C-alpha cells in the first residue's frame, strides 16, 4: 500500500504546430500520438518546452488522426509558440511492487512530427 | 541524445574508449572497416552502449561480436541495434550469426528468436 | 490498479470579480458554478489565467449562490486581478479502465459570468 | 472509486521566524502547529507567501514544541524571508463520497505566531 | 481511506555533473544513489536547486553504478548547471495510519558526490 | 474557440474546404442560402465539425443533410447543433427530418429520440 | 479577512445593507446601541454573516435575535459568535436567551446545548 | 546544516546555552576538556541536540553522561553520535559505559545493544 508515481509515457521532441490563446484551453494531440504514448483524452499531462525552458501542466484532448497536430491552446499558449520542441508526459500511480517492473510507453519524433520509434524503456546513461 | 543506431566509419577518441569497454578482447586497430566489413553501434547521451560487426557478401550477411554493456541490458538496446542493422541492409536475404564467444547461449537464443531468427547448429539464421 | 489523473471538470473563461490580498486565502466560487463543474468546497483546484499567463493551484471555497462571484483571495491575489479571464479546473484519480470512459463536467461562460452551456465532452480538433 | 484531492488543513498567516539556505532543506514547524492543522512530520506541504507572492512545495519537519518556529530551510530559503507571512497547507486524497462531508483542520494566527483559533470549516463568501 | 503524501526519500546536496539540453530529457542518477534513497528508475522526482533557487519536477533514469553521475538532461537543463548543488526528492502516498510511522530514506553527500551517511529520520529543529 | 453553433450566410474559403469534408456529395455553389433555406454549422477551434440544412415554411420546418464528422462523434456536437437550431427558430412548432441519405437508421433514431423527436414512417417528427 | 467577531458601535453603509439581510424584520435606526445594549456580529471578507443583540444588567445578560445567514450555516459561525460574546463579557455569570422568533426550536436547542446552555421553559440558560 | 557530530574544544555562547539544556546538572566550567577528556556533540541547524563525555586511556575508553534532548529522541541522533565517537577513536579496543545517572536502564540497554555493546554488571561494554 505504498503508492509510487511513475512515468506512464511520453512524446519525445514533438514540435508545436499551433498555439492560439483563443482556442479552447487544452493541448490537442494527434490520436495516433496519444495511442503510441498511452495518453488518454482528458488525462492530465505535463509539457516541458526544450526551446524556451517553460514547464507547465494541462490536460490532453484529441486531434484528428493523422494530422500530426500538437496544438497548445488557451492560457497554455502563453507558454509555447509554433515550432517549439516539447516533451509531453503523463504520470500514473501504482503500488510499489508493480512500479519496480513498470515499463513506460515512449514514442520518439523527428522532423515534422514523424514518429520514428516506440519503446518500453530508456537506457542507462554511462560514463 | 536518444538511443540511435549508427554505422561507424571513423572512430573518435571517445568511440575508442567506449569500444574498449564493449569489446575488451579487441584492440583496434585490428578493427578494419570498409564497405563490406562494417561496425554498427548504439549511441545514447554521447556514449556507445552496444556494437556488432557485420560482414556483407551481397545477398548473404554475417553478424559477429554482438554485445550490449551489461549495465544497460534488457532495455531494448540489442533489439534496436539488430533491427536497424537489418533495415539498413535490405539487399541481404540471408543472415547468419555464429555462436562464437557467446557467454550464455540460452539467453542468446531467446533474444535471437525474439528477432525472428531460428536456432541451428552452430548459430542462428534468418533467411527470408 | 494503474491509476490515472483525469480532468474532473472545468469553468471555462470565467471572469475574476474580486481579488484581495487581505481576504482569506482561497478562491471563492458561486455555488451554482461549483455544482455545474462538479467542484467541491475544500477541493484542490488549478487556475490558468488567460489574461496574464499565470498558472497556480489553490483550493475552492463557496460563494453565495447566484452572486456570480469568482474571488481570488489571499496570496493568490498576486496572480490575478479583477476582470482577468481564468479557467478553473479540478482533477480526480481513477483506475485506468474507468478513465477510458470518463466524461468531465464542463461549464462555459460569457459576459459577466453568465453560464451559457454545460457539457460532458470536448470535441476533437481537426485540421 | 473516483478520488478527490481535498485541503486537509492549513496554518493561516504564520510568520517565518528563520530562513537559512544552509539549514537542512525542509520547513520546520512548531509541533503544536502541526498538531492543530493535522500536518505530519515528513508530509508534503504547499507554502503560499502573502508577502512576496511566491508559491512552492516542500515537506514538513518538526520544531520544538512551544518555540513558535516556522523555519524555511535549504533551497526553500530562496522563496521566503524572515518576517514573511505565509499560508502552509496540506492536501489529502479520499473517495468522492467522503470528500463531500470532509472538514479540514484550520488554525489561525496573529502577532508573533500566537494561535488564536482552530476551526473545521471556512465560511461562505457573500455579496 | 484518507491518503497522505509523504517524503519517500531524498538525495541531500548532490552536485550536478552534467547538464545538456541535447541529452534525453530526464535526470540520470548513479544507481547506488537511487538505491540509497529508494528512488526507482522511471519514478517522478522533484529537484530543488540550492545554487539558483529553481524548483522543477521530472523523472529519474539510471546512470552507471559507481559513476557518481547526476545528469540534468533535456529541457531540465534550463534549470541547472554543472556544479549546482541540488536536493532530489521522491514522494509516495499511503494511508494516514501508515503515514504516522513512516520513515523516509535519506542519503547525505559531500564533496564530489561522496555518500557520507544514510538515515531514516530528520531530527527536530530546536530553538 | 469553444464549440459554437453558427448560421452561415457567407462562406469563407475555409468554410468551403470544411463543408466539402462534411458533405462530399455537394459541391457549393449548389448551396443557395436565403431567408428560408439556412445552413447551421458547429464550429470548434476555427473549423466546422458538423452542419445541417434547414428549410422554413413559417410554423413548419424541415431538416436535411445532418452530419457530424466521423472523427468527432459521440461528443455532444450533433445534439448541440440541433438544440441550437430549434432554439433559434422559436416560431416553428412542427419539425420534420426525412430519413434520406442516413447511413445507419438505428443510430439516427436513437439520437433523434434523445432530442425529443418521434420516429415515424420516412423520418422523425417533433410537433409541439 | 478571516472570520472575526466584532462589537458594532457605529454602522457603515455596508453594515446597514448586511444587517438588513440578517434581520429583515428590523429597520435601524430602531437599533439603539449603548453601553448595555450591544450588537456583536461575525465578519468575513468584508461582510457581516451573523449578528446577535446583547443586553447587559451587570452579572445578568440576555441574548436575542441570534441569526446566521442561511447560506453559511453549519460552518461554525454561530458557535464562534456566541463564544466570543461570552468571552468578551466575563462579568456576566448568568445568560438567558428567550425562544422568541426562533424558526426551528429543535435546531436551536441542539446548538444551544453544544454551547453549554440548558433548555428551560421559554428559552435557554447558562448560569455558571 | 545536516546532523553532524563534532568534537568540542572551545565553547561558543550558543554551545553553553545548549549544553545547559542537555546537561542541566553541570555548570561548565566544571567541563575541563583536554586531549584525553573529550566532549562530542550532535549539531543540527546551528544547535546542539545531544552530547557525551569521553575519557581516553589509550586502548581503553570510557563514556559517560550520554544524553539526547527528549524532544528529538528516536530519530537516530544517539546512534550517530556514538558511531562517530567510536569511528574517530580507532585506537580504543575496549569501551565502557557505566550505568550512572541513566534514567531508564531498559531503554539504555536496548540502545546499547543496538550499537553492539553487551550488558554487564554496572554498565555496558564493547571490547573488540
Ligand atoms: C567479443 C564478443 O562480443 S563475442 C559476443 C559476446 N556476446 C555475448 O556474450 C552476448 C552478451 N549478451 C548481450 O550482449 C545481451 O544480453 C543480448 C544481446 C543477448 C540482449 O541484448 P539486450 O539489449 O539485453 O536485449 P533486449 O532488451 O533488446 O531484449 C529484446 C528481447 O530479447 C529477449 N531477451 C533479452 N534478454 C533476455 C534474458 N536475459 N532472458 C530472456 N529473454 C531475453 C526478450 O524477449 C526481450 O524482449 P522483452 O524485454 O520485451 O522481454
Ligand atoms: C448528405 C448528407 O449529410 S445526408 C445525411 C447523412 N447523415 C448521416 O448519415 C448521419 C451520420 N451520423 C452522424 O452524423 C452522427 O452520428 C449523429 C448526427 C447521428 C449523432 O451526432 P453525435 O455528435 O455523434 O451525437 P451526440 O454525441 O450529440 O449524441 C447525443 C445522444 O445521441 C445518442 N447517440 C448518438 N450516437 C449514438 C450511437 N452511435 N449509438 C447510440 N446512441 C447514440 C445518445 O443518446 C447520445 O447521448 P449520450 O452520448 O449522452 O449517450
Ligand atoms: C429577528 C431574529 O433574528 S429572531 C431570532 C431568529 N433566529 C433563528 O430563527 C435561528 C436561525 N438559525 C440560525 O441562525 C443558525 O441555524 C444557528 C444560530 C441555530 C446555528 O448557527 P450555525 O452557524 O449554523 O451553527 P454552528 O455551525 O456554529 O453549529 C455549532 C453546533 O451546533 C449544532 N447545530 C447547528 N446546526 C445544527 C443543525 N441544523 N442540526 C443539528 N445540530 C446543529 C451542532 O452541534 C454544531 O456543531 P457541529 O457542526 O460540530 O456538529
Ligand atoms: C548527566 C547525564 O547525562 S547522565 C546520563 C543520562 N542519560 C540518560 O538518562 C539517557 C536518556 N536517554 C537518551 O538520551 C536517549 O533516549 C538514548 C541515548 C538512550 C537513545 O538516543 P536516541 O537518539 O533516542 O536513539 P536512536 O534513535 O539513535 O536509537 C537507535 C536505536 O536504539 C534503540 N532504542 C532507542 N530508543 C529506544 C526506546 N525508547 N525503546 C526501545 N529501543 C530504543 C532502537 O533500536 C533504535 O533503533 P530504531 O529506531 O531503528 O528502532
Ligand atoms: Mg538493452
Ligand atoms: Mg459529437
Ligand atoms: Mg456557520
Ligand atoms: Mg534521535
H24 Cα to chain D: minimum distance (Å): 18
Cβ burial, residue E4 (10 Å; 0-12/13-18/19+)? buried
What is the enclosing helix (H) or strand (E) of C95?
strand C85-95
SS3 A91: strand
- Contact by Cβ (8 Å): A109, A13: yes
The three grid cell numbers given for residue B126, joined into one nine-digit string: 534468418
Distance CA H56, CA H52 (A): 13
C123 CA to chain D: closest CA distance, Å? Answer: 23
- CB < 8 Å to E91, chain D: 44, 59
Q: Which residues contact F71 (CB under 8 A, 6 or more apart)?
A: A64, A65, C124, C126
Ligand 7 centroid to residue G69 C-alpha, Å = 8
Q: Which residue of C has its CA nearest to A22?
A: C50
Query: Based on the structure, what is the number of domains in chain H?
Result: 1
If we measure between CA atoms, which residue out of C111, C12, C52, C102 comes closest to residue F3? C12
Chain A residues lying within 8 Å of F21, measured CB to CB: none
Mutate to test the pocket of ligand 3, among G19, G74, G75 (most ligand atoms within 8 A of CB): G74
Q: For residues H95-122, b (16+ Cβ closer than 10 Å) or e, as one string?
A: bbbeeeebeeeeebbebbeeeebeeeee
* Partner A contacted by B41 (CB < 8 A): no
- Residue among F50, A88, A87, A12 at smallest CA distance from C126: F50
Nearest to B70 by CA among E66, E16, A103: E66
Neighbouring C-beta atoms of residue D23, cutoff 10 Å: 21
Q: How many CA atoms lie within 13 A of A68 on its CB side?
A: 12
CATH number of residue C109's parent domain: 2.40.40.20
Three-state secondary structure along D15-72? ECCEEECCCCCEEEEEHHHHHHHCCCCCEEEEEEECCCCCEEEEEEEEECCCCCCEEE
The parent domain of residue B91 ranges over: 1-128
CA atoms within 13 A on the CB side of G85: 29
The single residue listed with the C-alpha cell 512500479 is A99
The gap between the terminal CA atoms of chain H, to the nearest Å, is 33
Phi, psi of D66 (to 5 degrees): 90, -5
Which three cell numbers mark H101? 545517572
Q: Does A123 contact B at CB distance below 8 Å?
A: yes
Rounded to a whole number of angstroms, the distance from the CA of B106 to the nearest CA of chain E is: 26
Give CA–CA dist G117/G123, Å, rounded. Answer: 10
* Ligand number nearest to the C-alpha of B82: 1
Q: How far is the CA of D121 from the centre of ligand 3 (A)?
A: 14
Between the CA of H96 and the centroid of ligand 8 the distance, in Å, is 21
Question: Is-contact C6 C92, C-beta < 8 A?
Answer: yes
Rounded Cα gap, residues F99 and F120, in angstroms: 10
Distance from G105 to chain C by nearest Cα, in Å? Answer: 26
CA angle G19, G21, G23 (to 5 degrees): 65
**Would you list the DSSP string of B4-71?**
EEEE-SS--HHHHHHHHHH-TT--SSS---BTTEEEEEEEETTEEEEEEEEEEETTEEEEEEEEE-GG
- What would you report as the CA-atom Rg of chain C, rounded to the nearest whole angstrom? 15
Which segments of H9-73 does DSSP mark as H helices, in order?
13-22
Segment 65-84 of chain A within 8 Å of chain F by CB: 65, 71, 73
Structural biology method used: X-ray
Q: Do chains G and H touch (3 or more CB pairs under 8 A)?
A: no
What is the number of domains present in chain E? 1
CA pair distance C103, A92, nearest whole angstrom: 19
CA distance C112 to D70: 42
Query: Distance from the CA of D103 to the center of ligand 7, in angstroms?
Result: 13
* Parallel, antiparallel or unpaired: strands D44-49 and D85-95: antiparallel
Cα dihedral across residues H51, H56, H62, H65: positive or negative? negative
- Torsion angles phi and psi, residue D76, rounded to 5: -60, -20
Per the residue annotation, which of A23, A59, A67, A108 is the catalytic one? A59
Edge to edge, the sheet with strand B47-57 lists B4-7, B37-44, B47-57, B60-68, B94-98, B123-127, B118-120
Q: Nearest to residue D71, comparing CAs of E124, H18, H3?
A: E124
Ligand closest to C119 (CA) is 2
Residue C40: CB atoms within 10 A of its CB come to 22
* Domain span including residue A54: 1-127
CATH number at residue B125: 3.40.630.30
Task: Give the CA-trace dihedral at G9, G13, G19, G25, to 10 degrees.
Answer: 110
Strand partners, E89: E10, E46
Say which residues have a Cβ less than 8 Å from residue E41's Cβ, sequence separation at least 6.
Answer: A122, E34, E60, E61, E62
For chain F, state the CA radius of gyration: 14
Contacts across the A-C interface (CB distance below 8 Å):
91
Q: Which of D22, D28, D64 sits opposite H1 (nearest CB)?
A: D22
Task: Check if the beta carbon of residue H36 is closer than 8 Å to that of residue H58.
Answer: no
Partner D contacted by E117 (CB < 8 A): no
- Dump the DSSP string for A28-72: EEEHHHHHHHTPPTTBEEEEEETTT--EEEEEEEEE-TTS--EEE
- Grid cell of A126 as nine digits: 554511462
Task: Check whether B92 is labelled as a binding-site residue.
Answer: no
Buried residues in E50-80 as b, exposed as e (16+ CB within 10 A): bbeebbbbbbbbbbbeebbbbbbbbbbbbbb
Compute the distance between CA of residue F95 and CA of residue A104 in angstroms, rounded to an integer.
53
Q: Is chain G adjacent to chain D, meaning 3+ CB pairs within 8 angstroms?
A: yes
Angstrom distances, CA of residue G79 to CA of B94, G7, G67: 87, 16, 11
Q: What is the DSSP string of G67-104?
A: EE-GGGTTSSHHHHHHHHHHHT-TT--EEEEE-TT-S-
| Catalytic annotation, residues of E | 26, 59
| Distance from chain centroid for Cα G110 | 16
Q: How far from H20 is each of A83, B22, F2, H13, H31, CA to CA, in Å?
A: 65, 62, 69, 11, 11
Cα–Cα distance between F97 and D96 in angstroms, integer? 43
> If you write DSSP's letter for every residue of C33-53 in order, what string do you get?
HHHHHTPPTTBEEEEEETTT-
Query: What letter would DSSP give residue C23?
Result: S
At A47, list the grid cell.
509539457
Select from G45, G120, G108, G121 the least CA-distant residue to G82.
G108
Cβ of C44 under 8 Å from any chain D Cβ?
yes
Three-state DSSP state, G20:
helix
Answer whether E104's CB lies under 8 Å from E120's CB. yes
CA distance D37 to D109: 12
- H/E stretch holding H101: none
Q: How many angstroms is the resolution?
A: 1.7
D48 contact H CB<8A: no
Ligand 4 pocket test target in H111, H114, H115, H117 with most atoms within 8 Å of CB? H111
Residues in CB range of H17: below 8 A, 6 or more apart: none
Tell me how far apart the alpha carbons of residues B29 and A93 are, in angstroms, rounded to a whole number: 50
CA distance A46 to D24: 29
User: Do the chains contact at D24 and H71, CB–CB below 8 Å?
Assistant: no
> Cβ of F77 and C122 within 8 Å?
no
| CA C21 to chain CA mean position, Å | 20
Beta strand A55-63 pairing with A44-49: antiparallel
CA of G70 to the centre of ligand 7 (A): 9
Give how far the C-alpha of residue C99 lies from the chain's centroid of Cα atoms, to the nearest Å.
Answer: 20
| Pairing state between β E55-63 and E26-30 | parallel
Strand partners, G98: G123
Residue ID of nearest Cα to ligand 1 atom 8: B102
Question: Is G105 within any annotated ligand binding site?
Answer: no
Q: What is the DSSP letter of C124?
A: P
Please indicate whether residue F74, judged by its CB atom, sits closer than 6 Å to ligand 2. Answer: yes
Collapsing DSSP to helix, strand or coil, F82 comes out as: helix
Q: Does chain C touch chain H (at least 3 C-beta pairs within 8 Å)?
A: no
Q: Candidates B24, B74, B123: which one to mutate for ligand 1, based on the most atoms within 8 Å of Cβ?
A: B74
Query: Which atom of ligand 4 has the smallest separation from the CA of H114?
Result: 45
Amino acid at each position: 500500500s505504498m503508492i509510487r508515481t511513475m512515468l506512464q509515457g511520453k512524446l519525445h521532441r514533438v514540435k508545436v504546430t499551433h498555439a492560439d490563446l483563443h482556442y479552447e484551453g487544452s493541448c490537442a494531440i494527434d490520436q495516433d500520438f496519444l495511442d503510441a504514448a498511452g495518453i488518454l483524452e482528458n488525462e492530465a499531462i505535463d509539457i516541458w518546452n526544450v526551446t524556451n525552458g517553460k514547464r507547465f501542466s494541462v490536460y490532453a484532448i484529441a486531434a484528428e488522426r493523422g494530422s500530426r497536430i500538437i496544438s497548445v491552446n488557451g492560457a497554455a499558449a502563453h507558454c509555447a509558440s509554433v515550432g517549439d520542441i516539447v516533451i509531453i508526459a503523463s504520470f500514473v500511480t501504482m503500488p510499489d511492487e508493480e512500479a519496480r517492473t513498470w515499463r513506460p510507453n515512449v514514442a520518439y519524433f523527428e522532423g515534422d512530427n514523424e514518429m520514428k520509434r516506440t519503446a518500453k524503456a530508456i537506457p542507462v546513461q554511462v560514463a | 541524445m536518444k538511443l540511435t543506431i549508427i554505422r561507424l566509419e571513423k572512430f573518435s577518441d571517445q568511440d575508442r574508449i567506449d569500444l574498449q569497454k564493449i569489446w575488451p578482447e579487441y584492440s583496434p586497430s585490428s578493427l578494419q572497416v570498409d564497405d563490406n566489413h562494417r561496425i554498427y553501434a548504439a549511441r545514447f547521451n554521447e556514449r556507445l552502449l552496444a556494437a556488432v560487426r557485420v560482414t556483407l557478401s551481397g545477398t548473404e550477411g554475417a553478424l559477429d561480436s554482438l554485445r550490449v554493456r551489461e549495465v544497460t541490458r534488457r532495455r531494448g538496446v540489442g533489439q534496436y541495434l539488430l533491427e536497424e542493422v537489418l533495415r539498413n541492409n535490405p539487399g541481404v536475404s540471408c543472415w547468419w550469426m555464429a555462436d562464437a564467444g557467446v557467454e550464455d547461449r540460452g539467453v542468446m537464443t531467446a533474444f535471437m528468436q525474439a528477432l525472428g531468427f531460428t536456432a541451428q547448429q552452430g548459430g542462428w539464421e534468418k533467411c527470408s
